[PDB]
């Protein structure tokens, strides 16, 4: 069970160095058509990614402070505006949730 | 031996990754957007799946009623589930769910992904668009397409 | 201790001659105490040894490793340095030379065993070195083909004399 | 007026002229470029004082240069002096320049080295009010701002990053 | 005395670039701006007499360089390897765009030269047709029977131009140079003077490749490495050339490169 001889260093390095332990190269990265981030292929962007998780993180704590306390979960939609932007007539019943924002280059 | 075997082990056993799984569909329903590990995201896009098809299938039938007291614990989703993703999708068949994947997490380093349903009033993600149609070789392929059809 | 690598940056050649090359600029950074092992940073090295600095960098931000980033943030220094202070116009035309990663000052700790015993437990701290040489990278040493065997061969068989006489 | 300062400087002085002060301005200006040039220390800081020294000097450091002095064109002439105690003093002249720095490394980096270019000089001058000596102080390179010679290489001036 | 005629040809390509150089006022420097969908508002303070939007490119990444093929400035097309003047917006194209149809024209028209050169390198020329990309085939007509042997030689000699890795130097040159260069072929002097009647001066773009120079209108790809797949379909009739090719980073299949062969052999 004990090493009954030390390995030498040449056996070290060969044991350490062989293209099966060496990290792979990998070619899976584009460029993102938007602000040119360099991602990865079937992976989303990175600052798109960090965009939609802030708006979706305003977007939660402007409906917890129209909310107001746990346990509502009203069985209405949503729909989320901007600033101006008359409400659609389509969507006249649906509790509207925003405060001030400009839309921006990518929200429909 | 796992020779066409479902159902990964995650828990401690099959009752702590199926509480798991609800706690994680609870919350997809509360917030539409959940960051989970593949394989959990995945276990629980099937089981909204299904859960979806049971809140369709009626609001009066005791089934669906049970189905969905047991699958919510906050008791305050169901209402809002039977009124909203039931008449909402009530074309679609099986068309929820929109699966994709996140880089990375920044402790241990783990595949997570990112799952919502169809429509909602949340910004939308960046879905992989396909090359455009002005291309080479789609034009090419146009092209191809309007030779064939006029051979005939 | 023993700092050479960040007083290498100071070195200063003669005017050149209008009939000379352009003799490409090096550059020289290192970053001084890395929590961090010494075996995985020269993979990282090795990795990062003939490929530029944009694939380089291409590569670490999407490398699951602790020391990704800390590469990382050292390339773009050395190359923020390059363009500021080394003289250099280009930035994308800057390729990696030379990497290593040695061991640091390490401390010590003990660890317990579960008997009357214990084990000295060092904190391995490591080092981290990069030169990135002006110009575009060269290409790789492609491998010998069947006609270079055969010249080997036949120089080898013609470069023999007679042993053990006049 | 400028008289009121050079009877002090002449009080405190004491014994000192106004007409052989342009020559040994040149001869300041010629020491310390010289200086510059060889990478005198010691030289350059018994000339150019600190208010100006780590200006031309800095940036100067890890990289040669070749300058070279030549005739120059239109006579010296005083514009104003004014003065613990100090006497700033400004002298105008116009001399060919040759400008000829060069990079860490070498090859080139800003101008020819036979090129002889004009640029005219408004320096000030120090001097402390024991031992001192009259030396440089500041530039002003207003009022007319002359565009700068053409850059080499490329620069590239980044925008707001997001 | 095909040779003699190309040396004189490279030898007057020379020293036009020598007299364009000339008036170079001691190396004036710019500020050029750059408008673009990704990183704005950078800008860039290159030469106008020798720098190039590839040097922009190299600035900014190796990204660019490698899938910039076209730079838009103040909305027409430009070359990545062609001085620029006037500090003015900047832009890149890719194969991926929104309307990648300049891009897909200079292809067409790189193409079309490629074809052209292996044709005149092989053993008169007329012009070079621009032809819709919808068209699936770049033509390029050629006054004087082809086999299969023969369109197998053509198509390694593209193979050998593309593997040469060439840049493409463009002039914009008036119709007196241009007309110097082609004093044999009238097909090319008429051509010319089109061209030259055609814009408001007698200024005309040209283009060389090593020993091969060419007249034409749109920009081309900077270098033939862009071009990775390339083929010659057959000839119709004064003899009418076909051919299809692909650029990098657009890798098909053999199953639709054989359907577009089979498409534009007509
Ligand atoms: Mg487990
Ligand atoms: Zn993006």
Redesign the interface.
């Known amino acids: 069970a004990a090493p009954k001889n030390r390995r030498t260093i040449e056996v070290n390095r060969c044991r350490?160095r062989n293209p099966q332990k060496?990290?792979k190269?990998?070619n899976n990265?584009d460029?993102c058509?938007?602000?040119?981030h360099?991602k990865?292929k079937?992976?989303?962007?990175?600052?798109?990614?960090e965009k939609?998780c802030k708006?979706?993180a305003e977007?939660?704590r402007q409906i917890g402070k129209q909310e107001g306390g746990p346990?509502?979960?009203?069985?209405?939609?949503?729909?989320?505006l901007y600033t101006g932007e008359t409400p659609s007539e389509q969507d006249q019943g649906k509790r509207i949730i925003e405060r001030d924002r400009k839309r921006p280059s990518?929200?429909? | 031996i796992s020779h066409g075997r479902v159902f990964r082990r995650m828990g401690l056993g099959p009752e702590s990754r199926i509480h798991l799984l609800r706690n994680l569909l609870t919350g997809l329903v509360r917030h539409e957007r959940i960051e989970a590990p593949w394989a959990r995201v995945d276990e629980m896009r099937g089981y909204a799946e299904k859960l979806i098809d049971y809140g369709k299938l009626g609001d009066t039938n005791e089934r669906a009623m049970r189905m969905a007291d047991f699958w919510l614990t906050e008791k305050d989703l169901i209402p809002k589930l039977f009124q909203v993703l039931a008449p909402r999708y009530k074309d679609q068949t099986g068309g929820y769910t929109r699966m994709l994947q996140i880089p990375n997490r920044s402790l241990d380093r783990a595949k997570m992904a990112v799952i919502e349903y169809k429509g909602n009033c949340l910004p939308p993600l960046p879905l992989p668009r396909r090359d455009s149609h002005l291309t080479l070789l789609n034009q090419l392929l146009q092209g191809l397409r309007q030779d064939l059809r006029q051979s005939q | 201790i023993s700092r050479k690598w960040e007083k290498k940056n100071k070195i200063v050649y003669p005017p050149q001659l209008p009939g000379e090359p352009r003799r490409p600029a090096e550059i020289y950074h290192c970053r001084r105490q890395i929590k961090y092992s010494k075996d995985k940073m020269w993979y990282l090295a090795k990795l990062i040894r003939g490929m530029s600095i944009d694939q380089a960098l291409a590569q670490l931000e999407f490398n699951d490793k602790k020391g990704a980033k800390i590469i990382k943030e050292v390339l773009l220094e050395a190359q923020d340095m390059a363009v500021r202070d080394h003289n250099v116009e280009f930035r994308s035309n800057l390729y990696i030379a030379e990497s290593t990663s040695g061991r640091g000052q390490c401390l010590k700790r003990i660890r317990y065993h579960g008997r009357g015993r214990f084990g000295i437990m060092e904190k391995v701290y490591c080092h981290y070195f990069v030169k990135l040489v002006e110009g575009p990278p060269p290409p790789p040493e492609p491998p010998k083909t069947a006609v270079a065997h055969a010249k080997e061969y036949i120089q080898q068989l013609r470069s023999r004399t007679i042993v053990h006489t006049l | 007026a400028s008289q009121v300062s050079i009877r002090r400087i002449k009080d405190y002085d004491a014994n000192f002229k106004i007409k052989d002060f342009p020559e040994k301005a040149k001869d300041i200006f010629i020491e310390a470029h010289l200086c510059l040039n060889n990478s005198d220390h010691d030289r350059l800081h018994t000339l150019v004082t600190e208010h100006c020294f780590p200006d031309m000097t800095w940036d100067i450091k890890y990289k040669t240069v070749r300058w070279s002095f030549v005739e120059s064109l239109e006579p010296s002439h005083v514009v104003q002096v004014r003065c613990n105690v100090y006497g700033q003093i400004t002298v105008r002249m116009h001399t060919r320049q040759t400008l000829a720095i060069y990079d860490r490394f070498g090859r080139l980096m800003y101008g020819q080295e036979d090129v002889p270019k004009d640029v005219l000089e408004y320096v000030v001058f120090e001097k402390q009010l024991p031992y001192g000596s009259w030396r440089m102080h500041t530039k002003i390179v207003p009022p007319w701002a002359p565009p700068k010679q053409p850059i080499l290489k490329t620069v590239m001036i980044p925008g707001p990053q997001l | 005395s095909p040779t003699e005629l190309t040396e004189m040809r490279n030898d007057l390509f020379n020293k036009e670039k020598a007299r364009q150089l000339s008036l170079t006022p001691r190396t004036e420097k710019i500020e050029v701006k750059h408008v673009g969908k990704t990183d704005p508002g950078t800008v860039f303070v290159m030469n106008k007499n020798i720098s190039t939007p590839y040097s922009c490119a190299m600035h900014l990444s190796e990204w660019y360089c490698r899938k910039s093929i076209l730079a838009l400035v103040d909305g027409q097309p430009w070359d990545m390897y062609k001085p620029l003047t006037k500090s003015c917006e900047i832009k890149f194209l890719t194969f991926k765009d929104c309307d990648p149809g300049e891009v897909n024209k200079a292809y067409w028209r790189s193409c079309a030269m490629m074809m052209g050169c292996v044709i005149e390198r092989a053993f008169n020329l007329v012009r070079a047709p621009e032809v819709p990309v919808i068209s699936g085939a770049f033509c390029y007509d050629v006054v004087l029977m082809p086999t299969k042997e023969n369109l197998r030689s053509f198509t390694k000699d593209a193979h050998a131009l593309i593997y040469k890795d060439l840049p493409f130097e463009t002039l914009e040159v008036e119709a007196k140079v241009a007309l110097e260069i082609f004093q044999h072929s009238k097909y090319k002097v008429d051509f010319i003077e089109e061209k030259a009647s055609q814009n408001p001066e007698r200024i005309v773009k040209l283009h060389r490749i090593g020993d091969f120079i060419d007249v034409s209108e749109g920009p081309l790809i900077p270098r033939t490495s862009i071009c990775f797949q390339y083929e010659v379909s057959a000839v119709h009739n004064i003899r009418r050339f076909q051919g299809v090719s692909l650029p990098v980073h657009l890798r098909a299949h053999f199953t639709i490169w054989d359907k577009l062969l089979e498409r534009s052999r007509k």
């Open positions: 350490r060496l990290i190269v990998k990265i460029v058509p938007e602000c040119g360099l990865q079937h992976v989303l962007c990175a600052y798109c990614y939609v708006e979706t977007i939660r346990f509502k979960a009203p069985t209405i939609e949503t729909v989320v990518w929200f429909t």
